[PDB]
Design a protein around this ligand. Structure first.
Ligand SMILES: Nc1ncnc2c1ncn2[C@@H]1O[C@H](COP(=O)(O)OP(=O)(O)OP(O)(O)=S)[C@@H](O)[C@H]1O
Ligand SMILES: Nc1ncnc2c1ncn2[C@@H]1O[C@H](COP(=O)(O)OP(=O)(O)OP(O)(O)=S)[C@@H](O)[C@H]1O
Ligand SMILES: Nc1ncnc2c1ncn2[C@@H]1O[C@H](COP(=O)(O)OP(=O)(O)OP(O)(O)=S)[C@@H](O)[C@H]1O
Ligand SMILES: Nc1ncnc2c1ncn2[C@@H]1O[C@H](COP(=O)(O)OP(=O)(O)OP(O)(O)=S)[C@@H](O)[C@H]1O
Ligand SMILES: Nc1ncnc2c1ncn2[C@@H]1O[C@H](COP(=O)(O)OP(=O)(O)OP(O)(O)=S)[C@@H](O)[C@H]1O
Lengths: 620, 511, 239
C-alpha cells in the first residue's frame, strides 16, 4: 500500500494511451528485455547523450508489454516508476525516510517477480539520506529489477565513484539516430501535433525539418531537435490562422506608435525639433502606403495558407540562430543584385575586390556554396591607405545595418606564441578558465558575424596554425571541448606585405612569409591597386559629406564651391600614402579656421558658411 | 494556497498600472508567445547581456495579456513570479524545502494550465537544495509548467550549460541591444513618468541628446538604459535647483563661509611666518565676496524680469543639462564653453609660453588641436590629438608635454607617462597589455589599459620612442587612428579622448 | 607528403565505411597543443582543481566506446611532450589519465598526419621525420607512408567526383547538370599546378560553374526543377 503512495504506474498510464509512439529502436528494447530476464543481477541501465531517447525506450517497452509482444517471463509485470523526491519530503524525523524506503522495498520484494521498479535519473540515488544505500544487498540477489536511465556524464560523475554499486548494473548504450531514422520517427508523431493544433503538416516539411536542423542547429542531438521546428511552425501557423496574419501585424503596430509619437511631438515649443517632425510624418505616410497596399492585396487573395510548408521550417530556423535560411523573400533579390553598386557608395575603385566579395554572398545565399566550409575566406592586401579595412567595415555595414556587429580582433597583439590561449581559453585547471575563449565565445553565440583579422602578418607564425582548420573545415575547439561552428561566417585577412611591387614582389613576400598549406586553403588573394588622381574627387566629396553630417548637429551646412572642391583634390594626393593626407588636409584647411571662427562669435549656429579658394589657401 | 506564500503576482500588478510601459520589441514578444504555446517543452528563456531589456519584455507580455492582444490560447491566464529565497528561508530540517517545492509544483499542475510561471535569473535554480532544482525535470519536459525565464548571456554559460540534461528543456530567445533610433522612441514613450515623479518638464531635444551622447562616451554599458540614467539625474538635479538657491551660488557661499572660519582662527597666531599667509587669505576672501555679491545681484535681475513679464502677460531640463551630467560622469568635458573657458582657450599660446620658450610651431599645433575638439569639429572616433615631435637635446620637447598636461588638469602627475627606454626586448609588450588567461599575473590587467580605463581624459606620453624594440610600434599601430586596444580579459578600452605624444631624438643635428 | 593530395580524406574514408558515418572518429586537431601545459586537456585535470568533473578529452571518448579510429592532424606542430604521452599507447596498449584510471587503446586505429619538408622525394622528408621525432617512437609504428602528387590522368576522375558532389548538392532544389565531355576535360586541363594539390580544382569549379549558376538562379529564368547543360566557349563555359 506504500507503492501507490510513493510511486505511479507506467503500465496503467500506457493502457489508457497517455503515451506517444516509439516507432523504431528494436535492438535496444530487445537487449533491455533479455537483460531483464536474467537470473541474477538482472537490472539494466540506459545510458547516452541527453536527448537521444532513453525514457521513450522504457515507454515503448511498457506499450509492448501491454500489447503482449514480450516473451513468456514478462507477461503482466506492471512496471512501476519510483519517485525518491516524495520519500524524502516532510520526513523531518529521525528514521522516517529509512523506514519508508524499507517498507517500499519490502512491499516490492513480497511480490514474487511482478514489480519492475524503474527509477529515472537514478544518479540522484547516491545521497538523499541526510541512506539510499540500503539497496546493494537487495540488488546482488536478483530480487530488484531497477530499470534506470541517466545521462552519459552524470553516470561517471556520481555512480562510478561507488564501484560497489556499478558492479550490480548492466549498461545499455543508446546511440543517436541518423537523418533517415529521424524522418521515419517524424512520420509517426505528426498526427499528435496535427490533432493538438488545428493544422495540417506536410511530408516535405517533415523531411526539411530533419535535413535542415542537422546542418544549422549543431548544439543538441537529433531525434528531437527536429521536433521543435515542427512544433513551432504549427504554433506560428495557428497564431496566423487566428485573427490576423503577420507582416501586417507589424506595420499596424508600427503605424500606431508613430502616430502616438507625432501627436505629442507636434506641440513642441522649439525650433531645433522642427526638422525632427518633418520626417516622422514622411515615414508615417510611407508606412501607411504599404499598409494600405498589403491590406488590399489580402482581400484579393482571400476572395480568389492552411498547412505548414517547407519554408515555414526555414523561417523558424532563421528566427533561431540568427542565420538566414529561408528562400529569397522578395526585396532581398533586388538588394543582392544592387550589392555591387551599393557597396560603391563608400568604397571607390577596387571593383575587383567588390565583385569577389559580392560573388561569395550571392552564391551562398542562392545555395550553391559548399555547406561544410565557410561562406568565403579570402585575404586581400596591398599598399597603405587604399581601402582594405574600409571594405571590411562597409561589407558588415549593410548585412547587419550596424557597424559594431563585426567581430574585430587585431593581430598586432598576438606577437608571441603563448597569446593563443587568449582567443581559445585556458586548459582545465588554470586561473582564467570560466571566461572561455575570446574569438570562440563570440561566434558560438550568434554564429553569423563577420570576422576581421587585421594585420595578419604581425602575428607569431604559430597563430596561423590555429586558423589552419578554421579555413577549409570551419571548426575549432576551446578549452572546454566545445567545437564551435564556423561554416557560415565570412573571414577577412588584411596585411601590407611588399607595398612596393606590382604582383611578383608581393606574391614572393606572401610565399616567403606564409606556408603553402596555408595559402592553399584561401579563396582569391586580392591585390589592391592604389588610388588615381582622377577618382580622388569622389573621395573628397564623401569626406565633405561626412564632415557636413558631423557638424550638422547645429545646422551649419557649408556651401563648398567647385574650385575649392577641386583644389582640395589637386594637392593632398600622395602616390605613397593613400588618402589619409586628404583627411589631414581637410582639417588643416577648414577645420582649424572654422574652429577659430566658431568660438569667437560671429558664426553662431543655424548659419550657413561658404568656402572660397583664395590665391593659395581657401577663406571662409 | 502555497503559491500565495511563495510567489507574488505579475498580472495583478500590471492591471493597476504599477508597471512601466513597454515600447517596441515586437519580434521578441511574438517569439515568446509562440514558444509559450507549443505542445511539449513549452518554456522559453530570454538571454542577453545586462541592460538590454529582459524583464521589460515579460512585463510587456503581462500588459498585453491584461489588454487582450494575445492569441486564443493565452486569454485570461495569470503570470506568477516565483521566489526561491522565500522557499529556502526556513528549511533546517531534512525534508522541509523538498516538500515545500513539491507542494508548489502540485498547486501549479492542479490548475488546468491557467498559470504561467516566471523565474527571473533562473541560473539560481541549479542549486538551492543543499539537489533540488532538479525534480522539476519531469514536468519541464512534459510541458505542464510554462516557465518563462531570463538570465545574463554569461550566467547561462557558467551555471546552466554545465547541466546539459537541464538546458535541453529550455528554448533560448536572444535579446539584442537596441539602436539609437529605437532608444529615442523608448525615451519618448517613457518620459511622462519621470515628468510626474519630479515636478519638472523634459524637452524632447533633451531626449535626443541623451541617446545620441551616451553612445560615444559611456562605452561600458548597453543602451536602453545608459541614457535613462542621464535623464533621471538631470531631472533630479533640476528639481534640487527648483528648490533652494541654485548652483554656482551655493558653491561660493559655502566657500566664503569656510574661508571666514579659517581667517577667524588664523588671526590669533603669535607668529612671524603665518602673518604672510594671512595676507593672501583675506585677499582671496574679499575676491570671493565680490563674485558672490555679483552673482546674487544678477540673480535678482533675472527672477525680477521673469516675474514682471508674467504679471504683464531654467525650468526644464535640456541638452546641456544632459551634457553636464555626462561630464560629471566620466570626467570628459562636453559642454558649450560657458564663457569661462572660451577666453582661456583663446589665450592658449600665451600661457604655454610661460613655461616653454620658442617652439612656436609645436605650441600652435597643440593649441590648434585642443580647440578643434572643444569646438565640436574633430572626427568623433579618433584620438583628439596624435603627433610625434622630435629634435635635438635640451630643446623643450619633454617640457611641452608637461606644460600642456598642466593647465588642462591644474596638476602635473595627472598624466599617464610611460618611458619606452625599458621596452628594449619585444617580450616586454605584455607589460602594457597583461598576460593571457592561464599565466601567473592575470588578475591584474595591463598598466596602460587599466590607467586609461579609469580616467579617459588624461594625456599619454611615450618618452624615447626610438629606444624601443621595433615591434611595439606595431602594437601602437591601432591605438592611433582608432583609439582601441584590448587586454587579457578581452575588455576593449577607448583612447578616443586622449592626446598621444611621442618624443624621440632622431637625426640630432640634421637641418 | 605534399599538400592537398589526400592524406586527410583517407582517414575520413576509412571510418566512412567501417562505421557508415564520417563523424564516428575522434578527430583532435594537434595544431593547438603548442604549449607545454596543454597536455591537461586531452588527458584531464588532476582530482579536484578547476575541472576535475570534466575529465579528459581524448581518454574519455575511447573509455566509453573503445572501437573508434583516432586521428591526429598536424602532429608536427605539437609540443615535444605530448609525444612522450602518446608513447605509452604503443607497445603497452593502455593510457593512464590525470584521474588515475587506465584506458586501453587495444582496438583502435591510430593515424597521424604531417607536412614535414615537402621538398624531397623520400630522403629529405624521411630525414626530417627522423630529426624531430624519436627513433624509439618510430620503430613502433607501422609503415611511414609517403603520398604522391597528382597527374593529369588521375585528375579527370577527381573532376567526376566533384561534379557528382555538386549534383548531389543541387538535388535539394531538384536541379541537375549536363556536363559535355569537352567541359569535363577542360576543367581538368586547367587548374593543374603541381604544387597545390587538388584544391585549385574546387575553386575553379565555383568560379566557372557555381558563380554563373548562382547569378542566373536568383535572376529568375532558371527556376527549380529543370536541367541545365554546360558547354565550352573559346575561354569560358557558357550555360
Ligand atoms: N524512438 C522514438 N520514437 C519516437 N519518439 C521518440 C523516440 N525517441 C525519442 N522520442 C521523442 O524524443 C523526445 C526525447 O525525449 P526523452 O527521450 O524523454 O529525453 P531523454 O532521452 O530522456 O534525455 P534526458 O537525459 O532524460 S533529458 C521525446 O519527445 C520523445 O517522445
Ligand atoms: N577607396 C576608398 N574609398 C573611400 N574611402 C577610402 C578609400 N581608400 C581610403 N579611404 C579612406 O581613407 C582612410 C583609409 O583607411 P583604411 O582603408 O582603413 O586604411 P587601410 O586601407 O586599412 O590601410 P592600412 O594598411 O590598414 S594603414 C579612411 O579614412 C577611409 O575612409
Ligand atoms: N522596450 C522597452 N520599452 C520600454 N522600456 C524599456 C524597454 N526595454 C527596456 N526598458 C527599460 O530599460 C530598463 C532596463 O531594465 P531591465 O530590463 O529590468 O534590466 P534587465 O533587462 O532585466 O537586465 P538584468 O540582467 O535583469 S540587470 C528598465 O528601466 C526598462 O523599463
Ligand atoms: N624652450 C625652453 N623653455 C624653457 N625651458 C626649457 C626650454 N628648453 C629646455 N628647457 C629646460 O630644459 C630642461 C629639460 O629639457 P627637456 O625638454 O626635458 O629635454 P628634452 O627636450 O626632453 O631633450 P631630450 O632629448 O629628451 S634629453 C628643463 O629644466 C626645461 O626647463
Ligand atoms: N586522392 C584524392 N582523391 C580524391 N580527392 C582528393 C585526393 N587528394 C585530395 N583530394 C581533395 O583535396 C581536398 C583536400 O585534400 P586533403 O587530403 O584533405 O588534404 P591533406 O592531405 O590534408 O593535405 P594538407 O597539406 O594537410 S591541406 C579534399 O576536399 C579532396 O576532395
Amino acid at each position: 500500500q506504500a507503492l501507490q503512495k510513493y510511486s505511479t504506474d507506467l503500465t496503467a498510464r500506457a493502457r489508457e494511451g497517455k503515451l506517444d509512439p516509439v516507432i523504431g529502436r528494436d535492438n535496444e528494447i530487445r537487449r533491455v528485455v533479455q537483460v531483464l530476464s536474467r537470473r541474477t543481477k538482472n537490472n539494466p541501465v540506459l545510458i547516452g547523450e541527453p536527448g537521444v531517447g532513453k525514457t521513450a525506450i522504457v515507454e515503448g517497452l511498457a506499450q509492448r508489454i501491454v500489447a503482449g509482444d514480450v516473451p513468456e517471463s514478462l507477461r503482466d509485470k506492471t512496471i512501476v516508476a519510483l519517485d525518491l523526491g516524495s520519500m524524502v519530503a516532510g520526513s523531518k524525523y529521525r528514521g522516517e525516510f529509512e523506514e519508508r524506503l524499507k517498507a517500499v522495498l519490502d512491499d516490492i520484494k513480497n511480490s514474487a517477480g511482478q514489480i519492475i521498479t524503474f527509477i529515472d535519473e537514478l544518479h540522484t540515488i547516491v545521497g538523499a539520506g541526510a541512506a539510499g544505500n540500503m539497496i546493494k544487498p537487495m540488488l546482488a540477489r536478483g530480487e530488484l529489477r531497477l530499470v534506470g536511465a541517466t545521462t552519459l556524464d552524470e553516470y561517471r560523475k556520481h555512480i562510478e565513484k561507488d564501484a560497489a554499486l556499478e558492479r550490480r548494473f548492466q549498461q545499455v548504450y543508446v546511440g543517436e539516430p541518423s537523418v533517415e531514422d529521424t524522418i521515419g520517427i517524424l512520420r509517426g508523431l505528426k498526427d499528435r501535433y496535427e490533432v493538438h493544433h488545428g493544422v495540417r503538416i506536410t511530408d516535405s516539411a517533415l523531411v526539411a525539418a530533419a535535413t535542415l536542423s542537422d546542418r544549422y542547429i549543431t548544439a543538441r542531438f537529433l531525434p528531437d531537435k527536429a521536433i521543435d521546428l515542427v512544433d513551432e511552425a504549427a504554433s506560428r501557423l495557428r497564431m496566423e490562422i487566428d485573427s490576423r496574419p503577420v507582416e501586417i501585424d507589424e506595420v499596424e503596430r508600427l503605424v500606431r506608435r508613430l502616430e502616438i509619437e507625432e501627436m505629442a511631438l507636434s506641440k513642441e515649443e522649439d525650433e531645433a525639433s522642427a526638422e525632427r517632425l518633418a520626417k516622422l510624418r514622411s515615414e508615417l505616410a510611407d508606412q501607411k502606403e504599404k499598409l494600405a497596399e498589403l491590406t488590399t492585396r489580402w482581400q484579393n487573395e482571400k476572395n480568389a495558407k492552411e498547412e505548414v510548408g517547407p519554408d515555414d521550417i526555414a523561417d523558424v530556423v532563421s528566427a533561431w540562430t540568427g542565420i538566414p535560411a529561408g528562400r529569397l523573400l522578395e526585396g532581398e533579390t533586388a538588394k543582392l543584385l544592387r550589392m555591387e553598386d551599393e557597396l560603391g557608395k563608400r568604397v571607390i575603385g577596387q571593383k575587383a575586390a567588390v565583385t569577389a566579395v559580392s560573388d561569395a554572398v550571392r552564391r551562398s545565399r542562392a545555395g550553391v556554396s559548399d555547406p561544410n566550409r565557410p561562406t568565403g575566406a579570402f585575404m586581400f592586401l596591398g599598399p597603405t591607405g587604399v581601402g582594405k579595412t574600409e571594405l571590411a567595415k562597409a561589407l558588415a555595414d549593410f548585412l547587419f545595418d550596424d557597424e559594431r556587429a563585426m567581430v574585430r580582433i587585431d593581430m598586432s597583439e598576438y606577437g608571441e606564441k603563448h597569446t593563443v590561449a587568449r582567443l581559445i581559453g585556458a586548459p582545465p585547471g588554470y586561473v582564467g578558465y570560466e571566461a572561455g575563449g575570446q574569438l570562440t565565445e563570440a561566434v558560438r553565440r550568434r554564429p553569423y558575424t563577420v570576422v576581421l583579422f587585421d594585420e595578419i602578418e604581425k602575428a607569431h607564425p604559430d597563430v596561423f596554425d590555429v586558423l589552419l582548420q578554421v579555413l577549409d573545415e570551419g571548426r575549432l575547439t576551446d578549452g572546454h571541448g566545445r567545437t564551435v561552428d564556423f561554416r557560415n561566417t565570412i573571414l577577412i585577412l588584411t596585411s601590407n606585405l611588399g607595398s612596393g611591387g606590382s604582383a611578383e614582389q608581393v606574391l614572393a613576400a606572401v610565399r616567403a612569409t606564409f606556408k603553402p598549406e596555408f595559402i592553399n586553403r584561401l579563396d582569391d588573394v586580392l591585390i589592391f591597386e592604389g588610388l588615381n588622381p582622377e577618382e580622388l574627387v569622389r573621395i573628397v566629396d564623401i569626406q565633405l559629406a561626412q564632415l557636413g553630417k558631423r557638424l550638422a548637429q547645429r545646422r551649419l551646412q557649408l556651401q563648398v564651391s567647385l574650385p575649392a572642391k577641386r583644389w582640395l583634390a589637386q594637392r593632398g594626393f600622395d602616390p605613397v600614402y593613400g588618402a589619409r593626407p586628404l583627411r589631414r588636409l581637410v582639417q588643416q584647411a577648414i577645420g582649424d579656421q572654422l574652429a577659430k571662427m566658431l568660438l569667437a562669435g560671429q558664426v553662431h549656429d543655424g548659419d550657413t558658411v561658404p568656402v572660397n579658394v583664395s590665391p593659395d589657401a581657401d577663406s571662409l | 494556497q502555497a503559491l500565495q506564500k511563495y510567489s507574488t503576482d505579475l498580472t495583478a500588478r500590471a492591471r493597476e498600472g504599477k508597471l512601466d510601459p513597454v515600447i517596441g520589441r515586437d519580434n521578441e514578444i511574438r517569439r515568446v508567445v509562440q514558444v509559450l504555446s507549443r505542445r511539449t517543452k513549452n518554456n522559453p528563456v530570454l538571454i542577453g547581456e545586462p541592460g538590454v531589456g529582459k524583464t521589460a519584455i515579460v512585463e510587456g507580455l503581462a500588459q498585453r495579456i491584461v489588454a487582450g492582444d494575445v492569441p486564443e490560447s493565452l486569454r485570461d491566464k495569470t503570470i506568477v513570479a516565483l521566489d526561491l529565497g522565500s522557499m529556502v528561508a526556513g528549511s533546517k530540517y531534512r525534508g522541509e524545502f523538498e516538500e515545500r517545492l513539491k507542494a508548489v509544483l502540485d498547486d501549479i499542475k492542479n490548475s488546468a494550465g491557467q498559470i504561467i510561471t516566471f523565474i527571473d535569473e533562473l541560473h539560481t535554480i541549479v542549486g538551492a537544495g543543499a539537489d533540488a532544482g532538479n525534480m522539476i525535470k519531469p514536468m519541464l519536459a512534459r510541458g505542464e509548467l510554462r516557465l518563462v525565464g531570463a538570465t545574463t548571456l554569461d550566467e547561462y554559460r557558467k551555471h546552466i550549460e554545465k547541466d546539459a540534461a537541464l538546458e535541453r528543456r529550455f528554448q533560448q530567445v536572444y535579446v539584442g541591444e537596441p539602436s539609437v533610433e529605437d532608444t529615442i522612441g523608448i525615451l519618448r514613450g517613457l518620459k511622462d513618468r519621470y515628468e510626474v515623479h519630479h515636478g519638472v518638464r523634459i524637452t524632447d531635444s533633451a531626449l535626443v541628446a541623451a541617446a545620441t551622447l551616451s553612445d560615444r562616451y559611456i562605452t561600458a554599458r548597453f543602451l536602453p538604459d545608459k541614457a535613462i540614467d542621464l535623464v533621471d539625474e538631470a531631472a533630479s538635479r533640476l528639481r534640487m535647483e527648483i528648490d533652494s538657491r541654485p548652483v554656482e551660488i551655493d558653491e561660493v557661499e559655502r566657500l566664503v563661509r569656510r574661508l571666514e572660519i579659517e581667517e577667524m582662527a588664523l588671526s590669533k597666531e603669535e607668529d612671524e611666518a603665518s602673518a604672510e599667509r594671512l595676507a593672501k587669505l583675506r585677499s582671496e576672501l574679499a575676491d570671493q565676496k565680490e563674485k558672490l555679491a555679483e552673482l546674487t545681484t544678477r540673480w535678482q535681475n533675472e527672477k525680477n524680469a521673469i516675474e514682471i513679464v508674467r504679471d504683464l502677460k531654467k525650468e526644464e531640463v535640456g541638452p546641456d543639462d544632459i551634457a553636464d551630467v555626462v561630464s560629471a560622469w566620466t570626467g570628459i568635458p562636453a559642454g558649450r564653453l560657458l564663457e569661462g573657458e572660451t577666453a582661456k582657450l583663446l589665450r592658449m599660446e600665451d600661457e604655454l609660453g610661460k613655461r616653454v620658450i620658442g617652439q612656436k610651431a609645436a605650441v600652435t599645433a597643440v593649441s590648434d588641436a585642443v580647440r578643434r575638439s572643444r569646438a565640436g569639429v574633430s572626427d568623433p572616433n579618433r584620438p583628439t590629438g596624435a603627433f610625434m615631435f622630435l629634435g635635438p637635446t635640451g630643446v623643450g620637447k619633454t617640457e611641452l608635454a608637461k606644460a600642456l598636461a598642466d593647465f588642462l588638469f591644474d596638476d602635473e602627475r595627472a598624466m599617464v607617462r610611460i618611458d619606452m627606454s625599458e621596452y628594449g626586448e619585444k617580450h616586454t609588450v605584455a607589460r602594457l597589455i597583461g598576460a593571457p588567461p592561464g599565466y601567473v599575473g592575470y588578475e591584474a590587467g595591463g598598466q596602460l589599459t587599466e590607467a586609461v580605463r579609469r580616467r579617459p581624459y588624461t594625456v599619454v606620453l611615450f618618452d624615447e620612442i626610438e629606444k624601443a624594440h621595433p615591434d611595439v610600434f606595431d602594437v601602437l599601430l591601432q591605438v592611433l587612428d582608432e583609439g582601441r586596444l584590448t587586454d587579457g580579459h578581452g575588455r576593449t578600452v577607448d583612447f578616443r579622448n586622449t592626446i598621444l605624444i611621442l618624443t624621440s631624438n632622431l637625426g640630432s643635428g640634421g637641418s
